[PDB]
Write a protein that binds this ligand. Structure first.
Ligand SMILES: *[C@H](C)[C@H]1/C(=C/c2[nH]c(/C=C3N=C(/C=C4\NC(=O)C(CC)=C4C)C(C)=C\3CCC(=O)O)c(CCC(=O)O)c2C)NC(=O)[C@@H]1C
Ligand SMILES: *[C@H](C)[C@H]1/C(=C/c2[nH]c(/C=C3N=C(/C=C4\NC(=O)C(CC)=C4C)C(C)=C\3CCC(=O)O)c(CCC(=O)O)c2C)NC(=O)[C@@H]1C
Ligand SMILES: *[C@H](C)[C@H]1/C(=C/c2[nH]c(/C=C3N=C(/C=C4\NC(=O)C(CC)=C4C)C(C)=C\3CCC(=O)O)c(CCC(=O)O)c2C)NC(=O)[C@@H]1C
Ligand SMILES: *[C@H](C)[C@H]1/C(=C/c2[nH]c(/C=C3N=C(/C=C4\NC(=O)C(CC)=C4C)C(C)=C\3CCC(=O)O)c(CCC(=O)O)c2C)NC(=O)[C@@H]1C
Ligand SMILES: *[C@H](C)[C@H]1/C(=C/c2[nH]c(/C=C3N=C(/C=C4\NC(=O)C(CC)=C4C)C(C)=C\3CCC(=O)O)c(CCC(=O)O)c2C)NC(=O)[C@@H]1C
Ligand SMILES: *[C@H](C)[C@H]1/C(=C/c2[nH]c(/C=C3N=C(/C=C4\NC(=O)C(CC)=C4C)C(C)=C\3CCC(=O)O)c(CCC(=O)O)c2C)NC(=O)[C@@H]1C
Ligand SMILES: *[C@H](C)[C@H]1/C(=C/c2[nH]c(/C=C3N=C(/C=C4\NC(=O)C(CC)=C4C)C(C)=C\3CCC(=O)O)c(CCC(=O)O)c2C)NC(=O)[C@@H]1C
Ligand SMILES: *[C@H](C)[C@H]1/C(=C/c2[nH]c(/C=C3N=C(/C=C4\NC(=O)C(CC)=C4C)C(C)=C\3CCC(=O)O)c(CCC(=O)O)c2C)NC(=O)[C@@H]1C
Ligand SMILES: *[C@H](C)[C@H]1/C(=C/c2[nH]c(/C=C3N=C(/C=C4\NC(=O)C(CC)=C4C)C(C)=C\3CCC(=O)O)c(CCC(=O)O)c2C)NC(=O)[C@@H]1C
Lengths: 67, 160, 161, 160, 36, 50, 169, 160, 161, 161, 160, 161
């Protein structure tokens, strides 16, 4: 299954108001290609910046055998 | 393919293939000869099958070729026949692979969105695939036709 | 995001000063152009699908990309390209209505270039598709707002490239 | 701004802005002139407003300047007046934007612990905001004051 | 050894004060005082 | 009952906590315990708390 | 949630009717009341925290035991929670005043109030007493202010009272 | 309702209504008079609007009413006109409420699935609503025609 | 869930015996019926949308349910009814393949009556719709597999009641 | 059931205090409306059956509901439908006399939805019938008392919703 | 079984079974006679298989029946034979079902924890299963012996 | 992943041509070798633990890595090494069954080299361990099946290198 290796930082927007424990907003992730669009859109809407992304698993332009 | 689906299931369970899964893989391997025969028949009769399918679709639904239809003109008819050929090749690929996974991942996922973008009648495309299935069943052996009918019905249902 | 009207306020906050005539002139200009921008956004929202269809027909259909061996060949990849173009149109509309390209820079160009590079997406094909979108939207909206929308479309193309 | 709010809602719903949102944007665009007038009057007559507000607050709360207070040093007194000026500038920004968001993101969110870390009493600062709003409303015209007052009241709400 | 007999041993009784009127009946307390 | 396959990835950091949860919930182990034995509505309600 | 306009629309759609003269009349009444609704909402927003603080400072004198031992606001923690509930009541009452309908009140306030308060052991009588105290303060302040129309303000608080109040009779 | 949207947005942040939301509410209340005028004209003209839109649609798209079309037959044509009447009523609801929420809630959720089940061309339905838009806009001033065009275009977009 | 094989296996195991002749005869019967079950499942998967469409047209459309005030008035509510019919048809096919109405019991019936009672859904009318689905499926699949499908459809109806 | 007076007295009793000025204001408002309420109630009581006849003629007669296959077809079900309309009119009169819908919640809309669902009663048809009753009563009683009665009739209809 | 597994996967994906699953189910159903026959063979030889396997296991491992062993004592030895019969029955169930799911659900989940609480050596249990597999293979033809040994080795590997 | 059939179909679809003899010969070869691959996979599944144990004993045990201060000193590290080894064996069996190395390249060698470099696992010693595993599996399944499995094992070794 083709998957993306993404490096992104997503600083919180409601930590001050909610008073919750901090988490490292910078992370490297192996995200499925199916969920990658939703994950990237959520990251952009959250306000964080994705610094690096790549297709870790899979061959570019593959027509069959995605799964 | 059935083999890749079984491998995916075994990996998801984090285990080797069960005896039943291995037996199913062996059965698919044995039936691969008949699957290849059906694929050979379809690829050999690619031109005539698409020709009769397109003619039957045109007779059934003349509004496509009528003025105002999406497939109006020689170029539109050529595009429609090209789509016919693409889907028949996908059906052959699925029959060879033993499962509709290649068909779904090549020309069956997002088909509704693509036809909505292009204005094509999805029902018309489904009827065209049904005509292709009818002509293929008439042209090939009943057992091979029965085996390919499952894939054709899957494609037409997904396009429905 | 970051609106054009909010841009002057943000700059004034950064320099710790109040909005001046040198910036309130731009504020008044945005206020004057607000009606035109609102109408352009309404028109684009009404005719969202048709613009994408026309641009695809004028740019990508009957091309190497849509032909087998191209990145837009398979049905899933064609649907992905259509979704990308639709999102481009929607975010260009958002940028036009807001009067700035900050939303395009943030919510569009965050990692799109490297995602396309990893996926092997054709940069030139994307540029041509965005140009077709620009031409279609300019025709549908008029030159007055067509140039304004093409500004943000050129911004998107430059960011992608 | 209201434009930002509308576009954010549209993006959250994954849709273009609706008719009501567009008409609200139109209304804000119409009222931008009165927004500009608010900004001009406030920015060009802050000094009398800020002086009156500071004197009235220190008369009402004779503790910070008095022994055991918070404004012993001239530096502390200057800091209090600078906070007055910054809050009023933020109020001008918010009125021009047409929504709470500039004030909220500049000097509203986290302000309570902001001044807890500095030992400035939150009720004291909310009283300061009340007196500053009273001075600005008295110095503005009736419709102008009615337009500007809810922003100051919202800031008072957030403070306490 | 038998020091551990907390729940096992004899229960340690507590004292419960019967509920009495509070300031909710201050007016009636004053009424009783004047009727004294 | 466990999935060492996903455990190793979470341990070395290949997939962080969010993707671990996403894979585990759709794993057959959870599908046999909180989706298969339930109506869709009850399964959704349980999935919220999970 | 549904405001007055939306509830009227839903009512007419139930029968599948077009908006008739009575619908236009009710809409006109709400739209003319909207000015006073916005005015009252602005005033309550201006004096919100003071209103709740004064309402508590009257309610704990009306029923003093809520701060004495065995009372439900005994700790500062309990006191702050009680004031938070009072602030919630005021905010949702303001929302209901602007919306001219109590369904926004119901969906977000009353639909489980007795269950939650019984589970926490909170009294269900003193809370409505404080609600009515807030309503009295709000209407007195509105009458003092230049509010031509103020009758609608008692509707949300009274609906809260009727819903969350035990059926004595 | 715009009031509904503003109250919900404020409640999501758990604060009292912001001055911007109050301004939006006041603008909506002020424009309520024009809203009732537009809605009243639409409801009074509902018969002629529906009839003229149906005539235009049945002239532009004879396929839907020709034999083999979904609306073919007297009863089917009456049902198509009844659907047009439903959507005109929904447009009046949206006009009164100042937004498209009633239209979405009543007649724009799952409409694609419903009409696919019924076998109707959703593009034909959108064309019918578009013609209703044109006919209704012919019956009012420039401003009110543009105001109702928002609801009409929203229905068109949701149907296509 | 449980198919015929797992059902007989569990029945033997709970009392702790091996598989005797009687159980083996049941498994032989299931294996005999497996081909028909697979053919019926393929046919129903091909005609899933058409079956629900015809059933709705034959039972529910133009009744009191779709008219204003009915439980199928809003388009969302109509789509919900269609989705419920889709569930019923798909799970009937599942139970027909498995030869056991256990997936129906543990994934369609346990609490569904409570949900419809809360939502006001008319159980009698949904039973009528399921009967129409049964009739259409029988007409499209044949008497032998139609009866088997109708067995589980009636099981769902009885569970609902 | 709680009328306006009992509602005021309950609101005062749950707070433990005496009827202050607001309570007297509410009581006198209800008493002022009492003359109109009593007039409307007496007129409806006198013309009870005629109103039901007019509503049935306007809504259900000569329709598929009353034709064979309709829930109002058999004579027993026609009599039951008439009795239900009598219930709605009498309980609307009760709610008009009491100034409250509490009786409607306690006695009328209490289990009615699933009662009709189990019985197979057409909810939309009964809603339209109640609307016809409302309009006939409004015509027979006047605009003001007609609207007052229509308040409770629409409450019943929305409860059926 | 394969039917249950495929139906579960289809349900989880909220879809009908694909033809690639339907044909696998058809092949599994068709090839049931051999599985049944192996079932009757094992069930007929259950007593002899259990006795011979236990004898060989105890000869190979004396500590199990030695003083201090888990199976030391009359009742302990009889219970170990009972466990062997349990696992033989589970293997027969799996052979008949053409899958290892019945074995795993019945007597394979938590086996490690159960035998650890009992003090029994799971490795010795696996050795007993291995001896049972050897005896069954001896009593079965070459193909049938391999097919049954598939389930036997699955059980042995899961045990250890 | 891509098996032999999927890889062939993808290669055909890259040029968008039908299945010819140039790839149908490969399909025939795969279908012929399927039975041998299945038998080898069955043997590996039956003796998975034994093969790994023998390879570890003959390649890793009594070495510096197992000595304290080595990469396999702790019991947890030993368990991790065994888990890595039987992961390699199972995925090599998967690759052999599929006829292609895509499964190994995507689900095994995604970041294994970098992970081992970061952790400090001796890559060379892992290479000798995999060679021992290959020898054991070849001597336990057959010459042809042994070579078939060794192809994927050497592919994994090259990926590690
Ligand atoms: C203060 C000394 C400096 C400073 C602070 C500052 N930090 C942020 C944002 C974040 N800081 C953190 C904190 C952590 N991340 C971790 O991983 C850990 C341990 C687990 C900690 C403590 C995080 C997570 C963020 C992102 C937002 C969030 O709360 O999650 C900012 C905000 C920057 C912005 O503009 O968005 C600031 C200002 N700033 C200075 O100038 C000081 C030098
Ligand atoms: C014929 C049965 C139907 C029909 C055909 C038709 N198609 C087009 C245009 C295109 N068709 C496709 C489809 C595919 N391309 C792929 O690679 C795949 C999978 C292999 C599919 C399904 C595409 C991408 C196009 C765009 C043009 C292009 O390929 O470059 C047309 C032209 C429409 C127009 O207006 O230009 C037509 C007419 N039309 C019918 O009515 C039949 C139901
Ligand atoms: C169309 C004009 C061009 C084109 C498109 C294309 N894109 C993809 C796949 C993806 N595209 C994106 C893009 C975005 N995600 C976002 O959040 C944003 C903001 C709107 C953008 C622009 C993503 C994330 C994907 C991944 C999809 C997924 O499900 O993971 C494809 C498919 C690639 C593939 O390998 O299948 C295609 C074809 N292709 C062209 O040739 C045009 C130039
Ligand atoms: C054994 C031949 C060698 C060895 C092994 C060893 N590995 C680790 C730790 C990890 N190994 C992996 C590798 C994988 N995990 C996976 O899921 C897969 C793909 C499916 C692989 C290849 C990982 C991820 C780790 C990290 C920890 C984890 O549990 O996942 C260790 C211990 C490392 C530690 O720091 O504790 C050891 C000892 N050691 C040798 O000496 C051999 C050469
Ligand atoms: C001032 C010199 C002294 C004083 C007076 C005072 N208190 C109140 C009100 C309250 N005081 C409390 C006390 C407590 N809450 C706790 O949790 C604890 C336990 C450590 C304590 C001691 C509370 C609950 C209240 C509120 C209820 C009430 O009215 O009593 C007032 C009245 C304020 C007002 O009217 O708004 C006054 C005048 N408190 C001190 O601590 C000083 C010794
Ligand atoms: C104050 C007038 C009375 C009082 C209050 C009190 N309440 C609690 C705890 C809770 N109150 C609520 C209520 C609500 N939550 C909501 O979301 C809504 C509508 C928005 C309401 C009305 C809830 C849910 C709780 C518990 C959860 C929470 O607070 O987050 C307490 C705490 C009691 C304790 O011992 O902890 C108190 C004291 N107490 C009185 O005596 C007054 C009559
Ligand atoms: C006319 C522009 C198009 C058209 C219409 C058409 N519709 C039907 C049948 C139905 N239409 C609806 C739709 C709704 N009911 C609702 O309550 C709502 C929201 C208020 C909607 C949108 C329904 C439910 C039906 C089913 C029948 C019923 O009303 O009970 C038909 C007849 C279909 C048939 O075969 O019976 C037709 C013809 N057809 C076109 O071609 C136009 C594009
Ligand atoms: C004729 C001998 C007498 C007569 C008849 C008359 N009837 C009606 C109206 C209705 N009659 C019925 C009766 C039934 N419907 C049933 O389903 C059955 C049970 C099998 C019966 C007995 C009904 C329901 C109606 C209502 C109208 C409708 O059918 O939809 C009328 C018309 C009344 C009017 O004013 O509308 C008449 C004239 N009248 C006589 O004088 C004769 C004694
Ligand atoms: C003695 C009480 C038991 C016993 C011992 C035994 N062990 C081995 C071989 C090894 N033992 C270990 C264990 C560890 N090595 C470590 O570094 C640690 C970390 C705390 C442990 C627990 C290892 C790794 C080996 C492999 C050889 C090596 O050390 O390099 C043997 C020999 C096995 C063989 O096949 O040669 C034996 C005999 N045996 C018993 O029966 C006792 C119960």
């Amino acid at each position: 299954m083709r998957m993306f290796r993404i490096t992104a930082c997503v600083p919180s927007q409601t930590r001050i108001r909610t008073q919750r424990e901090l988490q490292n907003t910078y992370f490297t992730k192996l995200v499925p290609y199916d969920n990658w669009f939703r994950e990237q859109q959520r990251i952009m809407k959250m306000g964080g910046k994705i610094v690096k992304v790549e297709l870790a698993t899979g061959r570019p332009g593959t027509n069959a055998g995605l799964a | 393919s059935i083999v890749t689906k079984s491998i995916v299931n075994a990996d998801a369970e984090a285990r080797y293939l069960s005896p039943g899964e291995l037996d199913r893989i062996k059965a698919f391997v044995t039936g691969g000869a008949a699957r290849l025969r059906i694929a050979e028949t379809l690829t050999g009769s690619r031109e005539t099958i698409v020709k009769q399918a397109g003619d039957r679709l045109f007779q059934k639904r003349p509004d496509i070729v009528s003025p105002g239809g999406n497939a109006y003109g020689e170029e539109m008819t050529a595009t429609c026949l090209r789509d016919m050929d693409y889907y028949l090749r996908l059906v052959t690929y699925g029959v060879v692979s033993g499962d509709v996974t290649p068909i779904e991942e090549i020309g069956l996922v997002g088909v509704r969105e693509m036809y909505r973008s292009l204005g094509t009648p999805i029902e018309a495309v489904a009827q065209s695939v049904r005509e292709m299935k009818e002509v293929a069943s008439g042209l090939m052996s009943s057992d091979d036709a029965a085996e390919a009918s499952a894939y054709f019905d899957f494609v037409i249902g997904k396009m429905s | 995001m970051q609106d054009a009207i909010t841009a002057v306020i943000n700059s004034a906050d950064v320099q710790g000063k109040y909005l001046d005539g040198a910036a309130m002139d731009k504020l008044k200009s945005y206020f004057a152009s607000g009606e035109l921008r609102v109408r352009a956004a309404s028109v684009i929202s009404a005719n969202a699908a048709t613009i994408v269809k026309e641009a695809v027909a004028k740019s990508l259909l009957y091309s190497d990309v849509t032909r087998p061996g191209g990145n837009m060949y398979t049905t899933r990849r064609y649907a992905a390209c259509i979704r990308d173009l639709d999102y481009y149109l929607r975010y260009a509309t958002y940028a036009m209505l807001a009067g700035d390209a900050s939303i395009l820079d943030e919510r569009v160009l965050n990692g799109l270039k490297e995602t396309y590079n990893s996926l092997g997406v054709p940069i030139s094909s994307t540029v041509q598709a965005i140009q077709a979108i620009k031409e279609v939207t300019a025709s549908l909206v008029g030159a007055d707002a067509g140039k304004e929308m093409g500004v943000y479309l050129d911004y998107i193309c430059s960011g992608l490239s | 701004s209201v434009v930002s709010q509308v576009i954010l809602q549209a993006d959250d719903q994954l849709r273009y802005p609706t008719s009501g949102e567009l008409k609200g944007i139109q209304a804000f665009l119409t009222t931008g002139a009165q927004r500009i007038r608010i900004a001009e009057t406030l920015a060009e007559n802050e000094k009398k407003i800020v002086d009156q507000a500071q004197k009235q607050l220190f008369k009402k709360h004779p503790e910070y300047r008095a022994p055991g207070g918070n404004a012993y040093g001239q530096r502390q007194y200057n800091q209090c007046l600078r906070d007055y000026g910054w809050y009023l500038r933020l109020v001008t920004y918010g009125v021009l934007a047409g929504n709470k968001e500039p004030i909220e993101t500049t000097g509203l969110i986290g302000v309570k612990e902001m001044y807890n870390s500095l030992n400035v009493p939150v009720p004291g600062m909310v009283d300061a905001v009340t007196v500053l709003k009273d001075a600005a409303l008295g110095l503005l015209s009736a419709e102008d004051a009615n337009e500007t007052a809810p922003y100051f009241d919202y800031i008072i709400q957030f403070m306490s | 050894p038998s020091q551990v007999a907390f729940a096992s041993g004899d229960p340690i009784p507590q004292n419960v004060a019967r509920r009495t009127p509070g300031p909710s009946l201050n007016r009636f307390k004053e009424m009783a005082r004047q009727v004294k | 009952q466990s999935i060492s396959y996903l455990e190793s990835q979470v341990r070395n950091g290949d997939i962080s906590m969010k993707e671990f949860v996403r894979r585990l919930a759709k794993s057959p182990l959870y599908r046999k315990q909180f989706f298969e034995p339930f109506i869709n509505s009850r399964a959704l309600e349980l999935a919220f708390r999970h | 949630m549904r405001d007055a306009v939306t509830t009227l629309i839903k009512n007419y759609d139930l029968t599948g009717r077009y908006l008739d003269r009575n619908a236009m009349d009710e809409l006109k009444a709400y739209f003319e009341s909207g000015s006073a609704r916005i005015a009252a909402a602005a005033m309550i927003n201006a004096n919100s925290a003071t209103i709740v603080k004064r309402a508590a400072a009257q309610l704990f004198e009306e029923i003093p035991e809520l701060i004495r031992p065995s009372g439900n606001a005994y700790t500062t923690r309990r006191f702050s929670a009680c004031l938070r509930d009072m602030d919630y009541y005021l905010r949702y009452a303001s929302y209901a005043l602007i919306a001219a309908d109590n369904n926004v009140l119901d969906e977000r306030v009353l639909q489980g109030l007795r269950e939650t308060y019984n589970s926490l052991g909170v009294p269900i009588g003193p809370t409505v007493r404080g609600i009515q105290i807030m309503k009295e303060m709000i209407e007195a302040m509105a009458e003092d202010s230049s509010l031509n129309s103020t009758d609608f303000i008692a509707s949300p608080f009274d609906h809260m009272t009727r819903e969350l109040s035990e059926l004595s009779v």
